[PDB]
Amino acid sequence: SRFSLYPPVPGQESSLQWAGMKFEDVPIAHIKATYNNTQIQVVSATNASLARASCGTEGFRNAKKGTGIAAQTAGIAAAAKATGKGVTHIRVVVKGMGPGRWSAIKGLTMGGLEVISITDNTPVPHXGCRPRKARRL
Amino acid sequence: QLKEQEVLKLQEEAKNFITRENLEARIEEALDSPKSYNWAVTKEGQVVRN
């Protein structure tokens, strides 16, 4: 009789529904937080684009394009386009480990969207491609 | 004595080996009865089969 951090299991029956939607149906908010630009895309559970935003599209430029407040603005902008399209609940898959990793999730909350879960999909190779050489500075 | 027993056990076990004659019959018995190799231990080291 307690809350479960673990997400619902696909292909099973659960009592958790948000706005009369199951977990597999709630749209997904894909946040790619890189060290320079934070992009955001919201899609339906059928993989159809609904909203898109990024620090660049808001109008930030060069170094300012990669700050916390820049991603926050991008998240609010993505929310507004999604809210118009008919989105109230989002599943936040946050790829990347950049500065606007959290701020983009905070902007989406400020914009009127309700996050029900937070996933992480940062690429972690299991042995992969040789990274670039260390910078001598 | 040990080797004689081991040979005798294998000869007894060889009674139930699969062959072309009983292949189809043995296949259906396996399908009817699934097996499980899963079990878990506790902090006390006790098996906990479900």
Binding site: - | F17, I18, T19, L23, A30, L31, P34, K35
Partner: protein, 122 residues
């Protein structure tokens, strides 16, 4: 020697699954093997999507075949099963029972003194 086959089969109806297990076990015999036992583990969802013979698979039937065969037959068996269209993934290993659980008294304390000399000296 004694080998344990781990045969994941395509998810099918029992009539076709039984035909798949008869064709497979017959191949083992045709390669000079002596099949000892056949076990089923049930149909289940694969841990990930396995793509075999231009088809993606999410569910398969898990089966075990215990058998004896010469050391030279292991290669031929896996080659033949990989060409079968109802076999998701065949894996032959040496039978676990041939390996016997070792006997352990307990955890003997290793001193820290002898853990820092190793890390530093080499």
């Amino acid at each position: 020697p004694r080998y344990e086959l781990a045969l994941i089969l395509k998810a099918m109806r029992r009539p076709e699954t039984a035909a798949a297990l008869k064709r497979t076990i017959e191949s083992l015999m045709d390669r000079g093997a002596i099949v000892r036992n056949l076990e089923s583990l049930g149909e289940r969802a694969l841990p990930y999507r396995i793509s075999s013979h231009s088809q993606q698979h999410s569910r398969g039937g898990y089966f075990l075949v215990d058998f004896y065969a010469p050391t030279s037959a292991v290669e031929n068996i896996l080659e033949h099963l990989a060409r079968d269209i109802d076999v998701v993934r065949p894996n032959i290993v040496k039978h676990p029972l041939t390996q016997e659980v070792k006997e352990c008294d307990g955890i003997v304390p290793v001193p820290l003194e002898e853990k820092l000399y190793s890390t530093k000296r080499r």
